[PDB]
UniProtKB/Swiss-Prot annotation, chain A:
GO terms for molecular function: metallopeptidase activity. Belongs to the peptidase M67A family. This is 26S proteasome regulatory subunit RPN8. Acts as a regulatory subunit of the 26S proteasome which is involved in the ATP-dependent degradation of ubiquitinated proteins. N-acetylated by NAT1. Present with 19800 molecules/cell in log phase SD medium. Signal peptide: none annotated. Residues 4-137 form the MPN domain. Keywords: Acetylation, Phosphoprotein, Proteasome. The gene is RPN8. The keyword Protein biosynthesis does not apply. GO terms for biological process: proteasome-mediated ubiquitin-dependent protein catabolic process; ubiquitin-dependent protein catabolic process. It comes from Saccharomyces cerevisiae (strain ATCC 204508 / S288c) (Baker's yeast).
UniProtKB/Swiss-Prot annotation, chain B:
The chain holds residues 379 to 567 of 945 of the full protein. PC repeats lie at residues 1-21, 25-62, 67-101, 102-136, 138-171. Belongs to the proteasome subunit S1 family. It comes from Saccharomyces cerevisiae (strain ATCC 204508 / S288c) (Baker's yeast). Acts as a regulatory subunit of the 26S proteasome which is involved in the ATP-dependent degradation of ubiquitinated proteins. This is 26S proteasome regulatory subunit RPN2.
From Swiss-Prot, chain C:
It comes from Saccharomyces cerevisiae (strain ATCC 204508 / S288c). GO terms for biological process: mitochondrial fission; peroxisome fission; proteasome assembly; proteasome storage granule assembly; proteasome-mediated ubiquitin-dependent protein catabolic process; protein deubiquitination. Its EC number is 3.4.19.12. The gene is RPN11. The keyword Metal-binding applies. Belongs to the peptidase M67A family. GO terms for cellular component: cytosol; mitochondrion; nucleus; proteasome complex; proteasome regulatory particle, lid subcomplex; proteasome storage granule. This is Ubiquitin carboxyl-terminal hydrolase RPN11. It comes from the Eukaryota. PROSITE patterns: MPN.
Length: 254, 189, 245
């Protein structure tokens, strides 16, 4: 649908918020998220901690003001018009139905159904420490996948951070692990439809055909470069020391 | 072994100076002669330290503290006096990048040796804990100090130091491994 | 004199974002942080002054909105010292403005000391960063000393920048690049579509070389150079596909 950009700049401060707020698992540091929400891709420019209170001792019990956003957007606007409210974040890592209520607050404040944002404040597992949701209906809410933009400005200072194949395999288990269990979970959790929804694509395997040969046929040439790959080695470094040592081992005049 | 004190006497505190830091320089500058032999004056200075230890964030004091906080472990080096460590420990903990720096050293100097792990904890603790570059930094030294010849011992902290995101622990770890393994090569180390 | 500036890369990028788009204008606004003992320029944050249709000035600073924020920030728990000044200086190594100085200079008043952060958002985008912070005067120095007491201190006079974040966002950063399995193997196992090219690419390598080798019969293009770098680039990329099959 409108699946969305992600601003690391957000992501960072977001945890600072979590940090700043000293939010803990008891809590989720919540706040605006900013961008412009029109397109079938939405962007996250920015986001703002909404000074907030959360109580799950009573689910619906929690405290927040909008009027931040009120004054906020003003400045935000005054900062940039393109702030236009896309939605909001919280810590998370997970939902709590009161979110729904909370979600709807922003509905007043957003063009579309606004955008939830989960964060993993511990960034624990994997790609994203994050989920973004839009409500729905039998309610619906949903995660459309999202990701980063450029923000090379980001990417550059980013560059100042960090500092081939086997990984690619490694996830191999992962989904499968849960997956079968996830059945057995829901199986023996409810011992839904979506599981069968999965079930079909399963045969999408043992699918392989003598089209396999193509592979073999293909792989051949792949190797043809072999004699060439190291041929230049074969020729290159070997006849290189014979011209430097004969020069040298014999150099040896006086 | 006498005059140097008398040499510092005009620039000693209480003889004032042009600068408090000039006035501070003697403090450190003292034990240069007296290293190991000026412990008293040192402790005396430490008293003056201890005097200003829990207070007086004056840079002038800080230096005065620091310059003393320098000269203290200077003579106190190799001399294990918790006080040296201790009195600094808060002087340290007083978090004067000026002062607490020397503390990060003299304390080590005190326990330079096998030292004590608890300092090590705390040092290592303070390191990450205490918020300053150098104060955090010099701690690594004191670690390395009080990790001396210990070799296999500090390896954990070394590993911890190794494990440091930061230089400073990793940083000192090398020195630690040195003061641990200095002289004799541990190839692996 | 060797002074330790520390940035929230957030604030850094925040500025960048603000600054990157800020072209033409030098972006303006707060610089949130502190000074830990000496030397220590901390930055948690920063922010845009809203557009100045009067442009960057000592004047165009509005402390209203900061407080507004700062309140909401205080409400956010967001609080710092305003540590100086950061602007977007297209094609400017140079220095920002004596104004900007005076601007800051009026302001570093409000601190022990402040910065004026040079940014060329142009030259920033390079994949490396372009940036500086002046605050032109000292106490003595790292203690520089003389020209102040001799009066007439003017210069670029940078400060020494740094910044810190965490391994935390680092992950969340390096999270850049379900996932891998969905993201990786299998997600770019597309090769065979190009086998022709993959051939032809490899095919073309051949010719280039008989050529190259030939010259053996001076300086680079050398008969035994691009050979490998050429027939070596199609070797791997052609082996990774095998993982899928």
């Amino acid at each position: 649908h409108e699946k969305v950009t992600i601003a690391p700049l957000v992501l960072l401060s977001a945890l600072d918020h979590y940090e700043r707020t000293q939010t803990k698992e008891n809590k989720r540091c919540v706040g605006v998220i900013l961008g412009d929400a029109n397109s079938s891709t939405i962007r996250v420019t920015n986001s703002f901690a909404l000074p907030f209170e959360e109580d799950e001792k009573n689910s619906d019990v929690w405290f927040l003001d909008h009027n931040y956003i009120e004054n906020m957007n003003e400045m935000c606007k005054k900062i940039n018009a393109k702030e236009k409210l896309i939605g909001w974040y919280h810590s998370g890592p997970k939902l709590r139905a009161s979110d729904l209520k909370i979600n709807e607050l922003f509905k007043k404040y957003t063009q579309n159904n606004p955008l939830l944002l989960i964060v993993d404040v511990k960034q624990q597992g994997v790609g994203l420490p994050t989920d973004a949701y839009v409500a729905i209906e039998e309610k619906t809410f949903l995660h459309l996948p999202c990701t980063i933009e450029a923000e090379e400005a980001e990417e550059i200072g980013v560059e100042h951070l960090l500092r081939i194949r086997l990984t690619n395999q490694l996830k191999s288990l992962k989904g499968l692990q849960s997956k079968l269990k996830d059945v057995v979970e829901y199986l023996d959790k409810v011992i839904h439809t979506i599981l069968g929804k999965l079930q079909d694509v399963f045969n999408l395997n043992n699918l392989q055909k003598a089209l396999t040969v193509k592979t073999n046929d293909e792989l051949m040439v792949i190797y043809i470069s072999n004699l060439v790959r190291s041929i230049i080695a074969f020729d290159d470094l070997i006849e290189n020391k014979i011209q430097n040592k004969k020069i040298q081992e014999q150099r040896v005049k006086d | 072994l006498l005059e140097g004190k008398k040499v510092m006497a005009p620039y000693l505190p209480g003889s004032r100076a042009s600068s408090r830091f000039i006035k501070g320089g003697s403090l450190y500058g003292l034990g240069l002669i007296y290293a190991g032999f000026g412990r008293d004056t040192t402790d005396y200075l430490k008293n003056i330290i201890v005097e200003n230890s829990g207070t007086s964030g004056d840079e002038d004091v800080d230096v005065l503290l620091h310059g003393a906080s320098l000269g203290i472990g200077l003579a106190a080096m190799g001399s294990a006096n918790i006080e040296v460590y201790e009195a600094l420990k808060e002087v340290l903990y007083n978090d004067s990048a000026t002062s607490g720096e020397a503390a990060a050293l003299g304390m080590g100097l005190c326990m330079l040796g096998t030292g004590k792990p608890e300092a090590i904890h705390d040092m290592f603790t303070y390191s990450q804990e205490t918020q300053h570059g150098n104060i955090t930094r010099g701690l690594a030294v004191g670690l390395a100090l009080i990790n001396y010849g210990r070799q296999e011992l500090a390896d954990d902290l070394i590993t911890k130091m190794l494990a440091s995101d930061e230089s400073l622990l990793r940083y000192g770890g090398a020195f630690t491994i040195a003061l641990a393994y200095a002289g004799t090569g541990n190839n692996s180390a | 004199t060797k002074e330790t500036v520390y940035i929230s890369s957030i604030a850094l990028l925040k500025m960048l974002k603000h600054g990157r788009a800020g072209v033409p204008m030098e972006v303006m606004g707060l610089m949130l942080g502190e000074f830990v003992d000496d030397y220590t320029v901390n930055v948690v944050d920063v922010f845009a002054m809203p557009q100045s249709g009067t442009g960057v000035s000592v004047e165009a600073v509005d402390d209203v909105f900061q407080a507004k924020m700062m309140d909401m920030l205080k409400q956010t728990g967001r609080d710092q010292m305003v540590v100086g000044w950061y602007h977007s200086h297209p094609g400017f190594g140079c220095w920002l403005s004596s104004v900007d100085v005076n601007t800051q200079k009026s302001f570093e008043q409000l601190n022990s000391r402040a910065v004026a952060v040079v940014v060329d958002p142009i030259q920033s985008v390079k994949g490396k960063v372009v940036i500086d912070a002046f605050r032109l005067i000292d106490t003595g120095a790292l203690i520089n000393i003389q020209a102040l007491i001799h009066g007439l201190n003017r210069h670029y006079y940078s400060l020494n920048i740094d910044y810190h974040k965490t391994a935390k966002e680092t992950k969340m950063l390096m999270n850049l690049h379900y996932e891998e399995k969905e993201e990786s193997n299998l997600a770019a196992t597309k090769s065979m579509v190009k086998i022709a090219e993959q051939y032809s690419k490899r095919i073309e390598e051949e010719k280039e070389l008989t050529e190259e080798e030939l010259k053996t019969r001076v300086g680079r293009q050398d008969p035994k150079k691009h050979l490998s770098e050429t027939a070596d680039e199609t070797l791997e990329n052609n082996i990774v596909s095998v993982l899928t099959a």
